[PDB]
Design a protein around this ligand. Structure first.
Ligand SMILES: *C(=N)[C@H](C[C@@H]1CCNC1=O)NC(=O)[C@@H]1[C@@H]2[C@H](CN1C(=O)[C@@H](NC(=O)C(F)(F)F)C(C)(C)C)C2(C)C
Ligand SMILES: *C(=N)[C@H](C[C@@H]1CCNC1=O)NC(=O)[C@@H]1[C@@H]2[C@H](CN1C(=O)[C@@H](NC(=O)C(F)(F)F)C(C)(C)C)C2(C)C
Lengths: 306, 306
């Protein structure tokens, strides 16, 4: 029993972190094979960050202007290219610790582990969800850029995120490992808005199923509803509209507990309309939306990795 | 900015996990140097767990009754001893991945990372606090025993916990790495009570300081209090009594924010007496007590590890 927010083991990603310095600016890089990936704003000064022209700024840089360091060991840079907002530095040495990996673009609602890094060294690991507004709720300070997000599929590390910036509301923004930002964000120190953040409904239902599995089920009322009537109520609370695809993904949880998705939707409706009354669910006084149906199944089975 | 519950990177501990089988019972072991450590109830059958006599049960076991497996590789057991509730199996091969380590007994209120394991393979990592009642709020299923808790001090892994059992209220219990349980718990399948769980006051104050650091400070009232008047109110809410040692540990946070500990105590008093009114602090509708002053400082600086 017990339900906790859990990150994937980070060992396979720890071996891929390096420190990338250009001028005075130092950040983290991801060393896979003979390529190091980092945010392209490593070439900027503080002044440049205000309105950068990355092409012109990069045109003044050679391979020798990039200091790539793995522990107390320097890697020799023999190539460099800008791919969208990421800089790829080709090095003469392949990472002997390169795991089986792939680059993926995660969808909103999906979760991933973040290994927060400073000066190429891991500081900590935590779980995040890609919000519907393409922001994350992380914990990143100066030097954290280049810290990556990932999932583990038994032996294969799937990289999905690279940290670039923090927005005015305290939330975070970054790119996939090809350099494309999630959301409308740009890598420039200029005022940018995240936009209305909605609640990942399928994840809230998955979290209600974990609560039921773990004996916590006071919220289960005797009512039921329809997808359109539930959606009509959920949109009033800024909840993402539940679809038949979402219903099918909740399938294994619905089967393991004997509770129809539409019955669980009606209990969610009464929780949204009447609140929690100071009571808790899994030790929380709010409805939690950062656990996918897969996160709940993995934890209610104990899925292990290599 | 941003404040998240963060586990230490788990790579150094991943290399120490092995699978220990005795009869049909399989659990996790911690392989450091030429010794493997696991819960002594690996020698029990389901029936034995009801009222075990570990000495007599162990007396029927030889080195060859213990199957120790690292990946798809068997370790040859050449010695075995019971140290309190842990079984230590001496193997012919030292772990080539043994990091710099030490065994420590943590105090209540202190936190640590748990690398949850099944069949010797890591499944996930999360942070826990040793409650004042010597229980933890984990996420452990069948096979999770032998999963360990640890802290990292730059290069040195400090092992402080080994999982053994789950109590009736869903909470967890285990031992240090010498086999002594935290709390009054025994490794026997018999009804056992955790006892009244109190709130780690110094940690709640540390979490209020992280909230202030991260711009969240609505709760800051214009009142102040004394240690005895605050304690008189905190004991009514099952809060651990704040001491001058606690005040001194909050020092760096008090200095970084310009807020006296006793002023922060008065705001905590009004939060306990009048509630949060549906408002949140760091995205939480409850007062959080699983972040020590050290956890807050580490995150509001970005302390990194080897
Ligand atoms: C990279 N190490 C940091 C990560 C930041 C540091 C504070 N917390 C973080 O997440 N990235 C930056 O400092 C980026 C960088 C220039 C400005 N910057 C920002 O994150 C700024 N944000 C913005 O201007 C905004 F709102 F548009 F996102 C900052 C004001 C420092 C928070 C570049 C190139 C975007
Ligand atoms: C070891 N792999 C498991 C971990 C358990 C499995 C479910 N979640 C956990 O934390 N340890 C056990 O199954 C231990 C083991 C016998 C019984 N057991 C328990 O945890 C039981 N608890 C108790 O009887 C109680 F309340 F006293 F703690 C159980 C009923 C299965 C929860 C031994 C030797 C203690």
């Amino acid at each position: 029993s017990g339900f906790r927010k859990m990150a994937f083991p980070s060992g396979k990603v720890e071996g891929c972190m390096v420190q990338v310095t250009c001028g005075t600016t130092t950040l983290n890089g991801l060393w896979l094979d003979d390529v190091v990936y980092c945010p392209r704003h490593v070439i900027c000064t503080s002044e440049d960050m205000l309105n950068p022209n990355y092409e012109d700024l990069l045109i003044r840089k050679s391979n020798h202007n990039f200091l790539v360091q793995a522990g107390n060991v320097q890697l020799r840079v023999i190539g460099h290219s800008m791919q969208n907002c990421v800089l790829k530095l080709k090095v003469d040495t392949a990472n002997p610790k390169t795991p089986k990996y792939k680059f993926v673009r995660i969808q909103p609602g999906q979760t991933f582990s973040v290994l927060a890094c400073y000066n190429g060294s891991p500081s900590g690991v935590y779980q995040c969800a890609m919000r519907p507004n393409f922001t994350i709720k992380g914990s990143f300070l100066n030097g954290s850029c280049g810290s990556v997000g990932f999932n583990i599929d038994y032996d294969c590390v799937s990289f999905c995120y690279m940290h670039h910036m923090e927005l005015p509301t305290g939330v975070h923004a970054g790119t996939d490992l090809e350099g494309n930002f999630y959301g409308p964000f740009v890598d420039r120190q200029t005022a940018q808005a995240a936009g209305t953040d909605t609640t990942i409904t399928v994840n809230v239902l998955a979290w209600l199923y974990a609560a039921v599995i773990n004996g916590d089920r006071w919220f289960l009322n005797r009512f039921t509803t329809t997808l359109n009537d539930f959606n009509l109520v959920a949109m009033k609370y800024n909840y993402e509209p539940l679809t038949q695809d979402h219903v099918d993904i909740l399938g294994p949880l619905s089967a393991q507990t004997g509770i129809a998705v539409l019955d669980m939707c009606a209990s969610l409706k009464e929780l949204l309309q009447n609140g929690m009354n100071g009571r808790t669910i899994l030790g929380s006084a709010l409805l939690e939306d950062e656990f996918t149906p897969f996160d709940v199944v993995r934890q209610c089975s104990g899925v292990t990795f290599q």
